[PDB]
Amino acid sequence: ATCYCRTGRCATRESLSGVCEISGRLARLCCR
Amino acid sequence: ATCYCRTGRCATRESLSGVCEISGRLARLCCR
Amino acid sequence: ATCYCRTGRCATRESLSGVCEISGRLARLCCR
Ligand SMILES: [Ca+2]
Ligand SMILES: [Cl-]
Ligand SMILES: [Cl-]
Ligand SMILES: [Cl-]
Ligand SMILES: [Cl-]
Ligand SMILES: [Cl-]
Ligand SMILES: [Cl-]
């Protein structure tokens, strides 16, 4: 899948799909 | 629900209910 | 169980068994 670790809500074609971290802080994993 | 992100054990009327972070370190989510 | 919070893959006799943190960054929990 194509995924991004996001500061913001998942993009329209994406779904919240797990957990990642940005600088050690929990963040949305967004996948399409 | 009423929840707090705790350094300590959940208070008496609270239950461990998920995961949060305090300054980027995993911590207890306590809810009542 | 005997567990370690690892930067690397779990050792041969170990299995990935949960999540821990090293300096506030998610890491493998490896247990045997
Ligand atoms: Ca963290
Ligand atoms: Cl983002
Ligand atoms: Cl988690
Ligand atoms: Cl507790
Ligand atoms: Cl290690
Ligand atoms: Cl492994
Ligand atoms: Cl791996």
Swiss-Prot record, chains A, B, C:
Name of the protein in question: HD5(63-94)
Effect of R13A: Impairs antimicrobial activity against E.coli, E.aerogenes, S.aureus and B.cereus. Reduced induction of IL-8 secretion
Effect of G24R: Enhanced antibacterial activity against both E.coli and S.aureus
Consequence when changing C30S: Prohibits tetramer formation
Effect caused by changing R32K: Does not impair antimicrobial activity against E.coli, E.aerogenes, S.aureus and B.cereus. Reduced induction of IL-8 secretion
Section covered of the full-length record: 63 to 94 of 94
Disulphide linkage map: C3-C31, C5-C20, C10-C30
Phenotype upon changing C5S: Prohibits tetramer formation
Impact noted for substituting R9H: Impairs antimicrobial activity against S.aureus
Result when mutating L26A: Reduced interaction with B.antracis lef/lethal factor. Reduced enhancement of S.flexneri infection
